[PDB]
Amino acid sequence: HKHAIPANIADRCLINPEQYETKYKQSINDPDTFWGEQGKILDWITPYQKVKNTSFAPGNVSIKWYEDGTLNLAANCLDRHLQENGDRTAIIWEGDDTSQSKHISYRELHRDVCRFANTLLDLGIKKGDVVAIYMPMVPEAAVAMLACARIGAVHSVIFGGFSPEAVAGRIIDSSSRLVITADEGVRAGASIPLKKNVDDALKNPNVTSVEHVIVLKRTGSDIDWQEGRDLWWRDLIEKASPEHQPEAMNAEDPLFILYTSGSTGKPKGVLHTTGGYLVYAATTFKYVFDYHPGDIYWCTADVGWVTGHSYLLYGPLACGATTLMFEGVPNWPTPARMCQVVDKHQVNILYTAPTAIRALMAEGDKAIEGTDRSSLRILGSVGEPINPEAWEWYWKKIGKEKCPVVDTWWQTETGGFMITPLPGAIELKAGSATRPFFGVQPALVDNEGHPQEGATEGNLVITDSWPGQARTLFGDHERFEQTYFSTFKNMYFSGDGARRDEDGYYWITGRVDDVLNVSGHRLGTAEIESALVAHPKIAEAAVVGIPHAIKGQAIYAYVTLNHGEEPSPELYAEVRNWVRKEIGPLATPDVLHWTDSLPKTRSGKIMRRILRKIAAGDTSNTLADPGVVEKLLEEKQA
Ligand SMILES: CCCOP(=O)(O)OC[C@H]1O[C@@H](n2cnc3c(N)ncnc32)[C@H](O)[C@@H]1O
């Protein structure tokens, strides 16, 4: 069943059903005219002439948009709003402790970004240098990111929940010259030891590139200090000039890297450039959230993830919006926190994740108790499939049956929304991402690469480029080709499956590759296997996901110990804590299945479908030793 577009949205919407159809058609039939005009959402220092210049061809994957144009992202997100909107709040910051908040005007944000841009330059950071940012959800994380972009440095934001080992790996791969961090993060009443984690990471002997660590005194806790290397945020910024002239960057200058888990190996740095990325971020934000001047917008995603890059910071600031940055979690101190934040700051647009929605739904009316929620006009969901029932609960309880829900499918590699409703254009189906965005040509293919027509299911590919597309993997364009453009030739393979219904609506069913989705976190099964195998007692490991009401998927690890070793309950917690140390809490296995019965072909291939099935609780429906299946079932029952 479809939800109709409500009258209030019809009355204000930037894109109606007719306009979506018209614009979508032009975007496909004439990308140069379409994106040529749409690119004017940004200010350009030297105008572009070329618009679309892309290829997905074998051996010739090359993605360029607006390539002869120049611009500055920070001028688009800050400077150009100053004359008329300097006094407008750019960032509302809400502390974990509600007694703590700030409204940061465009003018104040610009001033600090200029100070910090000069701070970076004075420290010897140059255009093209990579800067690691390992920060909690505080406004200074935004300042750091915007200052890096302003001077053309390439920020690489590392999610604050990653372990020292995970932080070291990212620093090593990117050759980061500087780490920006805080003494501690504050989340749900608890402290995260960020600087200490940096300290431990930098002790890795393979870290050779870091010259300084800039530290924000957030809590003022006791921390170790390395004289010469470590520098206090306040001491530097107070000394810095508030005057900084932005310089022209080429459209195709690198903007940021984000380490992203894949089907094979360890996370790789997904690279975005400047022009097409920002155009796409601004355009998707504006149209999908139907943003009007004055709308208070709140995306709940951490700055450490792509959603935080595109839809907490860059898209909203480019459009001159007020964006809310929340330090804490949607359910602390109480499940009603998210809606208390909504009421306190009169949020009109809320964009959150199914894991959060499921967590609040489990508490029922405790999630809305004593809250009003009337300021909301638009709801959004991102990061994982949303089951219809959760969708309906979100729509009914948070939106009060008054707000369109925009379920936005996309990925780190795509820069911005790819398949999504537009609230005044597209009638909603609970659990469906609905239609492709302007410039996006999706298709479904079988495992052999044959396009599947009509209402059908298959491997979800995108058959042409779009401005927000990631341009390479950091220092490895050949792997970029292999990973995304070799399975289905001349096509971008998302690694997701999807069904398309009779209306042409897409229903994304999840990864078809060996990538998990655990509480909205994208994780490779292979990286968890490597982390497990690095443990001195463990010989072999096979990791699969299982359905989980709360997390969406849980991590189920089949583990073979070195010959001579025997399991114990102490070993269970030891191995869990080991993975917590190797990667972080986000990757901790929910189940450890001690076995000597890993199911291998005669060649040595591990049969993963059976392990997936057994772990899910299936008892029904090539192997070197076929009697392993029986043993595995028995052990699963224990
Ligand atoms: C979009 C921000 C998260 O980016 P990441 O690159 O970390 O994760 C991308 C993957 O998350 C899932 N995913 C994301 N959005 C949806 C969605 N709306 N529905 C179903 N699955 C989704 C899809 O499987 C996708 O391949």
UniProtKB/Swiss-Prot annotation:
Q: Which residues bind CoA?
A: 187-190, 307, 331, 519, 580
Record EC number: 6.2.1.1
User: One of this protein's Pfam families, by short name?
Assistant: AMP-binding_C
The keyword Membrane appears for this protein: no
- Provide one Gene Ontology cellular component: cytosol
The GO terms this record gives for MF are: acetate-CoA ligase activity; AMP binding; ATP binding; metal ion binding
Tell me what happens on changing residue 520 to S: Results in a 2-fold reduction in the catalytic efficiency for both ATP and CoA. Almost the same affinity as the wild-type for ATP, but 9-fold reduction in the affinity for CoA
Sites marked Hinge residue important for conformational flexibility: 513
Chain residues that bind Mg(2+): 533, 535, 538
In this UniProt entry, the residues modified to N6-acetyllysine are 605
Q: Which cofactor does it need?
A: Mg(2+)
UniProt: ATP binding residues = 383-385, 407-412, 496, 511, 522
In the UniProt annotation, what is the result of changing residue 580 to A?
Results in a 2-fold reduction in the catalytic efficiency for both ATP and CoA. 2-fold increase in the affinity for ATP and 7-fold reduction for CoA
Q: Which GO terms describe its biological process?
A: acetyl-CoA biosynthetic process; acetyl-CoA biosynthetic process from acetate; chemotaxis
Q: Which UniProt keywords apply?
A: Acetylation, ATP-binding, Ligase, Magnesium, Metal-binding, Nucleotide-binding
Give the consequence of mutating residue 605 to A: No acetyl-coenzyme A synthetase activity
Family recorded in the similarity comment: Belongs to the ATP-dependent AMP-binding enzyme family.
Q: What does this protein do?
A: Catalyzes the conversion of acetate into acetyl-CoA (AcCoA), an essential intermediate at the junction of anabolic and catabolic pathways. Acs undergoes a two-step reaction. In the first half reaction, Acs combines acetate with ATP to form acetyl-adenylate (AcAMP) intermediate. In the second half reaction, it can then transfer the acetyl group from AcAMP to the sulfhydryl group of CoA, forming the product AcCoA. Required for acetate recapture but not for acetate excretion when this organism is grown on ethanolamine. Enables the cell to use acetate during aerobic growth to generate energy via the TCA cycle, and biosynthetic compounds via the glyoxylate shunt. Acetylates CheY, the response regulator involved in flagellar movement and chemotaxis.
The subunit field of the Swiss-Prot or TrEMBL record says: Monomer.
The entry's protein name is Acetyl-coenzyme A synthetase
This protein's species is Salmonella typhimurium (strain LT2 / SGSC1412 / ATCC 700720)
Lineage of source species: Bacteria, Pseudomonadati, Pseudomonadota, Gammaproteobacteria, Enterobacterales
